[PDB]
Symmetry: C4
């Protein structure tokens, strides 16, 4: 479960990285950063896509990727972080 | 369910698109982009409504539209994305 | 329930409005706008508090107000929006 | 529970404060502010990490810290705010 969610998140992020570095001309790391803050709904305070293609893609990217990214964060904290803490609270 | 949620989301987004392109003078695609990043809580890093009418509308737009948009994203991933993946994990 | 949540949200927003218009010198409507986009986690693309007092308050404002604001949005859509739609889907 | 969540949130925020004030050169209060608005997904409208180290850290910081921060906000409102209000609604 966590593995599949992990793999799906990676693939989604790779897709955004390729798109923004190609269409919006961002350096790869910046495209990855934008993809991450966008899907986690944190938001980027400086960059906004400048092309109409970038705007449409971002809109679709958001609706399709948010559910996945949060499903991953949800399990990452509940089934991988909670225990390491919970079992650690045991005297 | 997913259909109704889909239709309701579209109508909400169309409303924002019309409002911002008319009151804030944004190009239609930009008004749609702003409506989308606002309701998904991602946020726009460059634009903020400039008129008092735009600010009040955005405030009300947020409170009324967030619940809907996320109800749609929730089902879009759970009742339309999960299966295509779940049934796909079956050897 | 919805009434109490409504009243609590209003009081929280009034507090932010007074704080930002006084300490950060924002026009009242702008202080209200900032308070709203901050507590709904949408975020403001142009303004960030400039004083250390504004930064500390915003930090505490966020932790205390997000839960409330979303509890209100949750009920606003589930116990006030769902029905108006659900009962409306009945032929 | 609330205590542990509180302590874990503090440690996470201290880590971000140290990182951004050191690598991105932000004043401590600004580093704390950025760490807070980032993990609560509110977002900062003016600052974005400028170094590649800052971008990578923020990406990892987000995935690991969001779950915790919201687990804390969830309990802060449900097991510490709800009662003070609920028991207060009793005539
Ligand atoms: Ba900006
Ligand atoms: Ba945001
Ligand atoms: K958000
Ligand atoms: K934002
Ligand atoms: K922003």
């Amino acid at each position: 479960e966590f593995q599949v969610l992990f793999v799906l998140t990676i693939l989604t992020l790779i897709s955004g990285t390729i798109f923004y570095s190609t269409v919006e001309g961002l350096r790869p790391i910046d495209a990855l950063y934008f993809s991450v803050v966008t899907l986690t709904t944190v938001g980027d305070g400086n960059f906004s896509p400048q092309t109409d293609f970038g705007k449409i893609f971002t809109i679709l990217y958001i609706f399709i990727g948010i559910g996945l990214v949060f499903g991953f964060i949800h399990k990452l904290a509940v089934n991988v972080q909670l225990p390491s803490i919970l079992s650690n609270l045991v005297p």
